[PDB]
Amino acid sequence: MKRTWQPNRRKRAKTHGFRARMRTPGGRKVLKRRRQKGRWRLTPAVRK
Amino acid sequence: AVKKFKPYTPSRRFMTVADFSEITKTEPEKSLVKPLKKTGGRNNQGRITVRFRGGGHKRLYRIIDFKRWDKVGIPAKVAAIEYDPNRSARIALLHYVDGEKRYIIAPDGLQVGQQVVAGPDAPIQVGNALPLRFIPVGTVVHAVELEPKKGAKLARAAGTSAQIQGREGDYVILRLPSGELRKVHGECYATVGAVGNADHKNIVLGKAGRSRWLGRRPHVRGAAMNPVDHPHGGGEGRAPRGRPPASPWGWQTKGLKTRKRRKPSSRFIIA
RNA sequence: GUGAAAUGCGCAGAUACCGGGAGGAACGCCGAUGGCGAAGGCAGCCACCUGGUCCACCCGUGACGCUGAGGCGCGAAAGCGUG
RNA sequence: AGCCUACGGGCAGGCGCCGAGGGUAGGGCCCGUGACUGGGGCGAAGUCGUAACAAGGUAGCUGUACCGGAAGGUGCGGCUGGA
RNA sequence: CGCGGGGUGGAGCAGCCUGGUAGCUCGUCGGGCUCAUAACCCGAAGGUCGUCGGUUCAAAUCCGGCCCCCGCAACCA
RNA sequence: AAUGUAG
RNA sequence: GUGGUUCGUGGAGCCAUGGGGGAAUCUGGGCGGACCACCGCCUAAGGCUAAGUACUCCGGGUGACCGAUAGCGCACCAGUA
RNA sequence: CGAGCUAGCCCUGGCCAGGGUGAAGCUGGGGUGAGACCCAGUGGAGGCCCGAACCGGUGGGGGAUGCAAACCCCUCGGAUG
RNA sequence: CGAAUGCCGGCAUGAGUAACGAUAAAGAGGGUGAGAAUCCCUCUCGCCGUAAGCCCAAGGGUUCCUACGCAAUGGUCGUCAGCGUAGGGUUAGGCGGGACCUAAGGUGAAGCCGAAAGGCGUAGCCGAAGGGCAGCCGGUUAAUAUUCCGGCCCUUCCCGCAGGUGCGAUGGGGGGACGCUCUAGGCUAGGGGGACCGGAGCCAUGGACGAGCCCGGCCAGAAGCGCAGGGUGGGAGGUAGGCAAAUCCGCCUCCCAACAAGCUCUGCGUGGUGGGGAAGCCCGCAACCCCCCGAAGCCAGGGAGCCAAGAAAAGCCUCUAAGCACAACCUGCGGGAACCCGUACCGCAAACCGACACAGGUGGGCGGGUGCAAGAGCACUCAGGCGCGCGGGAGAACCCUCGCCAAGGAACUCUGCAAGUUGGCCCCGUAACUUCGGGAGAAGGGGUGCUCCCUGGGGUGAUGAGCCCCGGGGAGCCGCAGUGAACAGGCUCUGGCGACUGUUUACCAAAAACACAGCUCUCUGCGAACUCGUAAGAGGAGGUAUAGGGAGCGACGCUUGCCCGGUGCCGGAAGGUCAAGGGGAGGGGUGCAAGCCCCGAACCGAAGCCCCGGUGAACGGCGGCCGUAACUAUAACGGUCCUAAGGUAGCGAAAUUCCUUGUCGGGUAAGUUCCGACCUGCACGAAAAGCGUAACGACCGGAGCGCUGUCUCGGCGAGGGACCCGGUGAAAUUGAACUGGCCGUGAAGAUGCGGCCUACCCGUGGCAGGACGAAAAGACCCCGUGGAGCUUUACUGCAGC
RNA sequence: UCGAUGUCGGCUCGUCGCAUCCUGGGGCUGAAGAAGGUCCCAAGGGUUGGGCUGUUCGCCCAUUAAAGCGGCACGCGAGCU
């Protein structure tokens, strides 16, 4: 039966993207936080 | 005339449809002026703000003329009566001598081939449009502006009319389809006659789909919800409001007047 | 308003009077112990469509008539359905 | 396969069609009867009123409609078998 | 059982929170009106205030006790 | 401004 | 009508101001805790000003600080798997 | 931070084996003063019927540290809206 | 540190136990290698075949191919692998996306709004599975191919040439361009037959040298031809319009032309050419034609009907503007130029989502053949692909899934739960009741195979011959049985509820719940009311009273009484009260005073509320005690007290009745249920509707008939487990244990105290009485000045008005 | 006993008590016989099939020698319902 997760790359990029964080203030801070944490990945990476 | 059906199915027993004598000999609408795609959309910036709207046949919009004083003095022939999905009345496509074409909300009596015209000059007969001053006190008349040059606001529901009741300076007394009595400015245009397709009131929808075809979603009663949901909501098994009937929002809905008290629209109204 | 009353309306300005407007129903006098219609029934004025009837002229058809089970239509008021 | 034979045939026997009726199922008409129920008829001296007959004390009857303990009332129209 | 209300002439009800006067309608009796009976008129009669105590100078009334009549409550399990 | 037992 | 001050409408000044009304130029004007009168303090409605003060990404010095279940989450390729 | 589950709406696409029933309208005849109507023949309507795909989840059994954090079997509802 | 259901770690117990993940199924002979049930090959056996086969999207991201490997992973094994190591592999102007278009929506010049962050928003830009658009068939690799190669064929830019023309947009117009259902005639895909053509071979086992048997009889293809379609009037003059700029569109006016031809555009066929090409022996002979059926695909923008009335923009045509006409377009033809990104492999799954090589979920297309009326259904089967990554034995109990059963037939049970019966098609034949469509598959019945004879239509041809397609009548044959297997309704009578098809508690409730067509009340006159929002803004609605918001009842039929005193809502230019404010009689504090500062009564002061009235499909309500008839009973009738007024019609022991299994009747041998009645209705009743109602229902009750392993009452059988062997090997739980019975005792329910009795040590297959057995710091209950959801005439506030 | 002692009835399986419903003894009798009544001794063995209700129980049908009453956590859900 259909589970929560249904990978779709368009979705993922439009939603958790670098460009998508940066437009909102709230998102800008996400990035700020993760940089400052040292995360190797600021964004959910996605590609083909 | 209202077609009634034989009961080869329940529901198709109560259902009745329109005659289409009305309109005949013209269905595909006028690619030219007629169409802008119409935007289905049952609310504003996110949130639904009219409950129970949605679904229903995809629909194209006919762009009608509600300000006829552009074409003063130019007559036009009535070229066809056609179907409009977007309102209760039918519409007439008329070719102006001008070349130019437009759709008028088709008044009663109006028939293909007639010539029709708008101005202070115009003959006092069907479909012609005129300032209210140059229209004889007593005639019925529809598609009435409310302020001059603002477009026709009154009397456009299928089978509606207003009646000229009296004069009074620059202003002119009007009995509205409601029963209200309102002064309207003399320069406010109006088209002689009433609206027609007046059987429209008598369609018997017939079943609950159809209601859906017209994009009307089911409407759930107040009590029928729970208290979070509604004032009437709640009560162990079935309930009697519990004083006094109210919208979801809470404000009273049996008898409470809502129009704004100090409106400058006042002084113009009298019923 | 009645038999006399009372309910009721009215100093928040009624009734009585005047002017301006809205709306619906019914048509005074003429009008009669009158007329028309098979009946039920039909009444202000105008125009249009249309039924029956009467008189006169002795012209035409030449018994082509009377009645009518059943059928078919009309049928006051009240009442019913939709608006 | 039998029995007869005047070898052709005959008889017995066997099969079929129909068939009294029996069976299964579904209908139609009539008769009897039923907790209860609706009025109807009748029954020397029961309760409540007084509708009708005298302008019967609201002329009366009438078709309908609504209402009412009951006669009955009231609306709409009609009749005179009232004036 | 658990709460609350009632008991007054023959019937239906006042009077009791605010002790000292038992009032009202119907009915009953006697007399009118009628040929007579209702209807109507005149004038009367009739109550131990369910009941035994307590308080008070004085109890239908305030305070308890028994006797009747009616009303609610009897839930979580 | 009601109603008047049977024969 | 409110805020700030220790001040919570208090006898409630002072400082600031959303609204209304609305001056004067030293006889000008604010203040000294309602308000009057003396006595005194100061010159609003323009602006700039180091230093002495805070903090520790970073460099260094110390420790009656820890010593790998401690010390930073991480002594180890960890903000990883 | 989430509507890559779920609920609604919007834009644009795709899907519904094959059976059955046979509305209206036509045509024809009959009918009448004209009509109404009745008859065949044609026609092909419907939140129509049976029933796959597809959607579902009625009843029973099974499973119950499961094949499964809702599954399997038989049975059952819708199936042009 | 010994306890915190403590925290991290390690190691026990259950235990060699349960399990090893679909009951589609295996067997043998050969290879290989240290080692083989598990790898390779062969042959037999079984399973899938609208697939479990083939191809595409998404997702995954090297899983692809080859060579080495076998520690770990693989539920066993492993020589194998999607595992480890290494090396290889993805080729495009035409496929798909981008240097084209717009949709919802996003963004956003201007513009607007917001304390900041930010919110809106016109043009424009972004945004696709929608529009537009140029490639087919073969051959090659170990692994890519419409991408490489071969053959044939196209498109766009730039340049030159020739010839044509008033050329020329960011502008105007046309077009692009549209729904559902039903369908015509042509094709094609695809399929069947052929006695015809081409083929290795074959005659077994009694017969067959046969019109035998087996295999195969194609595909792509420009121009031009055909054959079907689809689109389209052609003039000449006026010209108020297309934000006049037009020779174009639009609109008048009139010669011709016409259910045509023509001009034009697709499909299909044919076509120069190119390719393919079976069954067969150790890997190898070169037909390609005739008939039939035939699309849901093509011609396509085809036709008919119907209402609910069915995208946009570019490309493309055409019109004119500045301009420019030594430009510039248009049409040929030649030569040049032609980027970026993807292209392996999996892809209903062991490679995707489900922590797993998980019995679960996943969109699109192809999906052969025969038979059963049809079909994508059902049985077998082609191509192709699989036997589901632990086996080998036994032949208990018991469980699962299945088959059968004497006689009886619901006696089972809360309940026919479950299982049976019934089942397709053809033909007879079908009741009450009905809204009249229906109730109808009502019920009930008969037939069904095969051989031979005779016969009627239809399609294709051609009117004839075959090849299909529907039939009609007759004789006859075999079984227990002809829808011979598989798919495949049990029916009836009568209540309650809901009119109806529908919707819901994802994951215990599918219903009498919600929805619903329809009925009523109410608001709203348009910058509508109402909703979202601080605003700007937007929905409502590009609607306008026959329309929009709110509320209730919920098809239809027949109906919906009385009470406006209380509460709401509506109306009441008077009155009463009423805040700030106005007004200042009078009073006070200070100054020598001019003054400056306080209070402060009359009275003028909204809304609201008081007051007067209306209002029931507005919140709501709809009585008590006595007495009375010529038998008794009861009370048509009377008295009286209270209320705002005292329940009408119609229902009534009901989904509502406590007493209750009320009482009568029906039904049965027997009926606390059921059905029909009667009422003293504890406690029905009219739009939170009243009473009915055809039809509908996976809704709840009550009867029959049929039939049955439900039962009397159980028996036997099949398979998968359970048991034995070999391979791997968990779990909760666990203070420690050397863990018997009874009577007592004990915190009052003892293996563990007392007395007595009983008992050699240790396993295995079974059962579930006990260990107050396990799991979860009880849901019930109370407690806490614990929380949270909901309510209101609790309080106090706020939004709003 | 609330860091859980599943909580009616049914089925299945029983086992016990006697205050005995049958069956075996027996004494009184208002015991003629037959059949009762009543008490005494005695559970060894028995103690039915249905309709109605979830029912326990009860009433009813047809039988019977009889159609007993109790306890076992209102015995028995790690046995089922």
UniProtKB/Swiss-Prot annotation, chain A:
One of its GO terms (biological process) is translation. Keywords: Ribonucleoprotein, Ribosomal protein. Residues 26-48 are annotated as: Disordered. The keyword Ribosomal protein applies. InterPro entries: Ribosomal_bL34, Ribosomal_bL34_CS. Found on the solvent side of the large subunit. Part of the 50S ribosomal subunit. This is Large ribosomal subunit protein bL34. It comes from Thermus thermophilus (strain ATCC 27634 / DSM 579 / HB8).
UniProtKB/Swiss-Prot annotation, chain B:
GO terms for biological process: cytoplasmic translation. Keywords: Ribonucleoprotein, Ribosomal protein, RNA-binding, rRNA-binding. GO terms for molecular function: rRNA binding; structural constituent of ribosome; transferase activity. The keyword Transmembrane helix does not apply. It comes from the Bacteria. SUPFAM superfamilies: Nucleic acid-binding proteins, Translation proteins SH3-like domain. Residues 222-271 are annotated as: Disordered. InterPro entries: NA-bd_OB-fold, Rib_uL2_dom2, Ribosomal_uL2, Ribosomal_uL2_bac/org-type, Ribosomal_uL2_C, Ribosomal_uL2_CS, Ribosomal_uL2_dom3, Ribosomal_uL2_RNA-bd_dom. One of the primary rRNA binding proteins. Required for association of the 30S and 50S subunits to form the 70S ribosome, for tRNA binding and peptide bond formation. It has been suggested to have peptidyltransferase activity; this is somewhat controversial. Makes several contacts with the 16S rRNA (forming bridge B7b) in the 70S ribosome. Belongs to the universal ribosomal protein uL2 family. Part of the 50S ribosomal subunit. Forms a bridge to the 30S subunit in the 70S ribosome, contacting the 16S rRNA. May also make transient contacts with protein S6 during translation in the 70S ribosome. This is Large ribosomal subunit protein uL2.
